[PDB]
Amino acid sequence: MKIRASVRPICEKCRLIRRRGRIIVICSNPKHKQRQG
Amino acid sequence: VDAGIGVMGTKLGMMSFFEEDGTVVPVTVIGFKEGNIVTQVKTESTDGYNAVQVGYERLRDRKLTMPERGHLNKAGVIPMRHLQEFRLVSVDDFTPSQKLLFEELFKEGDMVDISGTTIGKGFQGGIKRHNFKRGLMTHGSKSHRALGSIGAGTTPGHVYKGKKMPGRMGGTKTKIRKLKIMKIDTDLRVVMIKGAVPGKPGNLLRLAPAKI
Amino acid sequence: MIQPQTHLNVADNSGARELMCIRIIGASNRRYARIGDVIVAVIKEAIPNTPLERSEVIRAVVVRTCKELKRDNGMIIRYDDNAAVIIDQEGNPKGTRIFGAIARELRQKFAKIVSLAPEVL
Amino acid sequence: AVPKKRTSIYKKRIRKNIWKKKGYWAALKAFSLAKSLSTGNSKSFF
Amino acid sequence: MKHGRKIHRLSRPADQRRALLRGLTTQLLKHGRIKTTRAKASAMRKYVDKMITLAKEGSLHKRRQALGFIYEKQIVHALFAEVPERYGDRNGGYTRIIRTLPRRGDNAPMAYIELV
Amino acid sequence: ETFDQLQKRIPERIIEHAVRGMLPKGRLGRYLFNHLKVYKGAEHPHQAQQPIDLPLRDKRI
RNA sequence: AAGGUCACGGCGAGACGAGCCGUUUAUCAUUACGAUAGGUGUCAAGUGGAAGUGCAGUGAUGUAUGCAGCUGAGGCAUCCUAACAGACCCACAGACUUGAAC
RNA sequence: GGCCAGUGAGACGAUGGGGGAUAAGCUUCAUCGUCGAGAGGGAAACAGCCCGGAUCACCAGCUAAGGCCCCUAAAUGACC
RNA sequence: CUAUAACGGUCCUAAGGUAGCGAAAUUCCUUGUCGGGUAAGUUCCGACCCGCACGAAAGGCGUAACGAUCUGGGCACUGUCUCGGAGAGAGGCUCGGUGAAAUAGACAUGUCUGUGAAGAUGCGGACUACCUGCACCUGGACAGAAAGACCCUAUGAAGCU
RNA sequence: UUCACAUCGACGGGAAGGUUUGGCACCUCGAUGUCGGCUCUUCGCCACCUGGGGCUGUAGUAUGUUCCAAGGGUUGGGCUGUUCGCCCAUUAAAGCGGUACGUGAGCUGGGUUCAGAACGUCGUGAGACAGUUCGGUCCAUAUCCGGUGUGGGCGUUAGAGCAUUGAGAGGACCUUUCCCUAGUACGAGAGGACCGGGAAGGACGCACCUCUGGUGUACCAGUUAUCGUGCCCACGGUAAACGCUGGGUAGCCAAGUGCGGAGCGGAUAACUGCUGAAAGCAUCUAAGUAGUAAGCCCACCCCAAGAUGAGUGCUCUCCUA
C-alpha cells in the first residue's frame, strides 16, 4: 500500500479506479498500487 | 440452554482418591439425600421454552406449605424441598410422573459443570474482594489498607458506577466448569469428583454436564 | 520460592561459594522460582583460584530449595538450604563434581545435572 | 464532613418519623410478651 | 467472619472472661438459682455441665481438676457428696434458662439459671 | 448497534424508538407512550374497539 | 382464611435488617423424612504420657499402671435441658369497557 | 448663565489603522450600532449579531426579523 | 613532533593570593575525567586542577576522644517489601440512658454533552432514574476554616541599617 | 550499482491537536493547596507488543515502512526529591498522553525554597540570590449528589408460595516458549519456514482446605519470678489485649489445591477476490456474491419484570350471620 493522498498516475498502465468511495491506482508493477485521496 | 438434564446433590467433605497408577488426586464427595425426581416438564406448547423441573430433599409435610405441596402432589410425587429446572432443547422425552432417575448418566461423560452457593464472607473490604494492594505499613504512612483514590478530578464531578468499593462478597451461586468425573459408588450413593465445589459440606449443588 | 535477592549456595565445584540470584528466566512469575528455573546469578563470593571472580553475572540452575516440591506420587520433598549449579545455556555446567543430592524431575530437561549427581533420592 | 446546608421540615419529619416508626415496631412485640405474661403455663418469668 | 468458631466470647477479654466463668459458675453452684444475662447464662450452662459431670466420677484426679477450676474450697467438697445422689440417671441437661424482664438501665436481655 | 442489528434482533424497538422522540417527553408523552402497540408479527392480539385503519395524508411514502 | 411477621432454639447466613434451618408423644415396622442448639456417651483429632501408688536412685530424675490424662469448635447416637406461652398483619371474587362461542 | 450631581475601570460587532505572528473574547486609537442602563421575538440554551424600543388592561386582529413533518404555532404547498 | 609554560615584555594598581587546600556546606556548565565500591551509583571515598565565585584569627590545614549531628557502605536481624494472612483488645455495627459541634439563603439537590463571568443538580437537547433508610468510601458541591502568610496597590504601620 | 516515490527526502508549501515553553489577563484570591511517589480508576490513538493485510533493494529466519484494529498487556531494580534520563538483567513489548500532581475533605518527601544556621558572591550596611547544604505540626464525626452493598414501604388490579424466560447491565473473552509436521520448502553454504496439532508455563479470575503450611488468646505440653489453695505433691491467679516458648483440630488464608479463557457461530474494518457494466479493452462494485481480525454482536459465568413495558407457568385460599 501507498497512501500518497495526491500523486498522479505514474506508470504507463496506472489505471484509475474509484471503488467503494475511495480512489485507487493500479498498475502492473506492485510499487504503484496506491489509494489516493 | 443446557446440553442435557443434570442432577443435584449435597457436598460431603473432601478426601484424596489414590489412583492405581500411583497419583494422588483431591476429590470432593457427593451424596444424594433423595432421588432427583422430575416433577414438572414445561414444553414449547404450554410455555415459551422447554425445561425439565426436578427436585430434591424429601421432607415432612409440616415443613412444606400448601402451594408447594399442592404443586408437588399435582405430579403425584413425594413432598420435597428443593426444586430446579434445566432448560433443554425440544427433543425431550420426560414424564413428570415420578421419574426416579438413576445416577448412571455421568460416568461415561467425564466432564461435568457444578453450581452452588459459595460460602459468604460478609461485608468485606477492597483488599480481598477485588485483590487490591495495601499502602505502606510504615514510613509515616496513614492509608493502611484503605481504598485510596476513588475518582478523577473536577471534570467528572462524580465517581463511575461499578467502581470497586467494599461490599458483601460471597453468597451468590457460581458455576465451575469442565470438572472430570471419577469413581461413583452404586451402593454408597456417593460420587467422587476431582475438584473443589462451591461451599462447605451440607449445601445444595447443581451437577449438570458441560456446555462447551 | 526463590526471590530475586536471595543467596543460593553452590551445588558444584565450578569456582563460586554463593550467589545473589537475579531475575529468573522462563517462568515469568519471577517472585516464585520453583525447581528447574534458571536464574541470572551474580557472584557474591568465590574461590580465588578459578576464572570466576567477584561481581560476575552468570546463569545458574536452582537445584535445591527450602520451599516444598509437590510431586504426583504423593511425596513432598524439601531441603534446608538453597542451591544452584553454575550452568551454561548448552546443557552441562563448567563445574564437574556436583555437591549434594538433587531431585529427579529435572532429568527431563537437565540430564547432565542428574548424571553428575551423587544421589538422585 | 461539615454539612453544606440544612434540611427542610420535609426531610426531617421523614427521618424523625422513621425513627419513631422504628419505635413503633418494638411494642407489638412487647404487647405479645405482655399478653403471654398473663394467665397461662409459660416456662419463663420467675 | 466467624464460620464455626463455637467459643462464646463475652464483652470482656480472654482472662477476664475466664474469671467471669469461674466466679459465676462458683456462685451458681453456691446458690443454685441465679440471675445472669443470657450470654452469661449459656456460658454458665456449658461449664457447669462440665463441673457436674466432672465430679460425677468422684476420683482424686477429677476432684483436683474440679478444685482447680472452682474458686471456693468448701464448695467442691460439698459437690461430689451431692451430685451422684441427685443427678444420677439424668445423663446431661443439669440446668434451665428461665428468662425474665430486661434490666432497668440497659435493656439487657436478662436470664435466670436453675439446677434441674 | 446498527439498524440491521435491531431489525434482525428486536424489530419492534425500531418504530418504538422513532415515535418516542416525536412525543413531548415529560409526564404526558410518557403516558401516551403506552398508547403505542407495535407488534412484529402479521397479526395483533387486539379486538378491543374494532380498530379502524389509520387515515394517511402523506403522498410520499 | 391461604401466606407471612414477632417470639422461640440457632446457623457453614450475617454490621442492623436480611436470608436459611428447626419450633415436641421431635415414628411404629420391612429399608431414605420428626434431633434445632447445649449437655451427655462414643469415634476421628491435638498435645502427648496426667495424678496417686510401687520400684531404682543420697538426691535431681527415670520407670510400670498407661497411645494413658486432659482437650471434643468436627461426625454419629441420645429427648436430659431449652424449643413453652403467645401475639399481630393480611379477610369477605377482586372497579369501568369491547369480541367470541356457550 | 444660576443652583446642583454623578461619571472619568468600559465591552463586543462593521469599517480605517498601529503593536502582535494582519494570532487571541489581545492592546491602543478614529466614525458608527448595541449592551452598559433594554424588556420582548428570532438565535436549542447564550450582554453586545438581526427585528425591535415594554404606561396598563383584553381568553382582541395585522405584521418585521425568522419560520410552515413531529417534539413546538403555521404548507408532508406548487413548479423548475 | 604535538604540546604545556620554567622564562619574558607591556598596561593599570596600594598590592596583585604566600603556605596549605581544592567539582569542597564553596563548581553554573556538570551526572567534569579517571580509579575504588555496586549486577547497575546525579549520592559516597580517593585523585587531576578549567577555583563561575577557597585561603591564612570574618583564621587556613590536620587529627585521638566525643555527638538523640549530617552522610556512604557492610554483618546479624526482621512484615519495611514481594504479598499479604490469622488472632487478642479500645472504637466502629445493634439495643437502653445522656447527648453536642463546626456548617447552614430556601432547597422538590441525576448523567452525558453544549452554552454561559470561558470548570452548571438549577440554562438547552437527549438518555437514565419508584419512594425512603441503614453500613462503608470520599470524586464533586470551585466542600468547612480564615476578610491569601506568597504577588501587587496604599503618598499605610512597624522593626532594622 | 541503473531507478524521485522498497527506504530517507534537501529548498519550500498546507494542515490538524491542545499533551511542552510561550502570548492575553477572561473566572477564582471574605483562600482554585503547587512537583514527585503509593493506592485506585477511566478514556484517546498520533501503535511498543499481541490479531489480520499491502509493499519491500521480501530467497527463508529476521525485517524496513504502511493500512485496519485500543479487547488485553506494557517488568524487577542501582543513582537522584526527582518528571525526564543513564545503566543492569530480561521480556512478545517494557508506548505516548487526557482526566486541575488525574487522585494530600485517601496517604508521605523536595518545595510558593516560612521562622534557626553555614559556604560562595553581591552590598558600606541592614539583608539578598529562580546558587548550595542541615533541621522544619499538616486538620477533619459526610448534609446532599455520586458509588458499592443491603433492606423496609408501596405498586405490579384479589391475596400469596415457588419455578424460571430475559430487556438491560457486569465479568470473562489475555499471552509466551518447547515438540511433531521438518532440519521439510528456500538457500552454493551458513541458516531455517508459512499452515495445522500437542505439551509445559506467566498474569488475571472464580472457587476450596483433601495434602503442605501461617494464624488459631477453643486447646494441650515445657519452664522462670511470685502470691494464694493450711503445709509436701499437684493446681489456680499475674507478669497488658497469651509471661516467654513448643506444636495443633474446626474456621480464615496462600505460598497450597482444582477450574476457566470455547465456537466451519453472525455481520464487518484493512485486504485478496468471482462474475461485471458507465467509455464492445479493462476494473473487488455500480446489480449480486465469496474468504477473513485478539476488533463488534451472540454463545460463556452471575445478578436480573421497580423491564411501571412491572412477564410466563404450576399450586393454595376467600367461609358464618
Residue type, F24: P
| Dist. CA F60–CA E82, nearest whole Å | 108
Q: Strand I: which positions are within 7 A of a protein CB?
A: 37-40, 79-90, 95-97, 102-112, 119, 121, 126-127, 132-144
User: In what side-by-side order are the strands of the sheet with E34-37?
Assistant: E34-37, E110-113, E97-99
Query: Which contiguous run of DSSP H or E holds residue E47?
Result: helix E38-54
Domain E1-116: CATH superfamily is Ribosomal protein L17 (3.90.1030.10)
Cell numbers at C52, concatenated:
570466576
Asked whether C82 and C66 are in contact (CB, 8 A), the reply is yes
Number of domains forming the structure of chain C: 1
SS3 at position B172: coil
Residue type, E109: P
Cell numbers at E101, concatenated:
424482664
Number of domains forming the structure of chain B: 1
Where does chain F break, by residue before each gap (C–N > 2.5 Å)? none
CATH number of the domain enclosing C121 = 2.40.150.20
**Count of alpha carbons within 13 angstroms of residue D27, beta-carbon side:** 5
Q: Calculate the CA dihedral of residues D16, D18, D20, D24 and round it to 10 degrees.
A: 170
Angle between helices E14-31 and E38-54 (to 10 degrees): 70
Residue E5 contacts B where some CB pair is shorter than 8 Å: no
Q: Which chains touch C (3 or more CB pairs under 8 A)?
A: B
Q: Is the sign of the CA dihedral C87, C90, C94, C98 positive or negative?
A: positive
Asked whether B81 and B56 are in contact (CB, 8 A), the reply is yes
Residues of B within 8 A of C73 (CB-CB) are 22-24
From residue E87, give the alpha-carbon distance in Å to each of A23, B210, E29, E72, E80.
Answer: 105, 60, 14, 21, 10
Characterise B55 by phi-psi region: left (phi > 0), alpha (psi -120 to 50), beta (else): beta
Cell numbers at C86, concatenated:
553454575
| Dist. CA C55–CA C60, nearest whole Å | 15
The answer to whether the CB atoms of E101 and D45 lie below 8 A apart is: yes
Proximity of residue B136 CB to strand J below 7 A: yes
Residue type, E19: A
Asked whether C81 and C2 are in contact (CB, 8 A), the reply is no
Q: Which range of residues forms the domain containing residue C29?
A: 1-121
Place of cell 434445566: B86
Q: Which range of residues forms the domain containing residue B128?
A: 1-212
Cell numbers at F13, concatenated:
424497538
Cell numbers at E34, concatenated:
441465679
- Please give the resolution of this entry in Å, rounded to 1 decimal: 3.3
Q: How far is CA C64 from the centre of its chain?
A: 7
Asked whether B28 and B72 are in contact (CB, 8 A), the reply is no
* The 3-state secondary structure of chain F, one letter per residue: CCHHHHHHHCHHHHHHHHCCCCCCCCCCCCCCCCCCCCCCCCCCCCCCCCCCCCCCCCCCC
From residue B204, give the alpha-carbon distance in Å to each of A24, B32, B84, B187.
Answer: 65, 10, 11, 21
| Dist. CA A28–CA A34, nearest whole Å | 12
Whose CA is closest to C16, among C47, C55, C51, C60? C47
Method: cryo-EM
Residue B11: strand pairing partners:
B30
Whose CA is closest to E46, among E101, E113, E99? E113
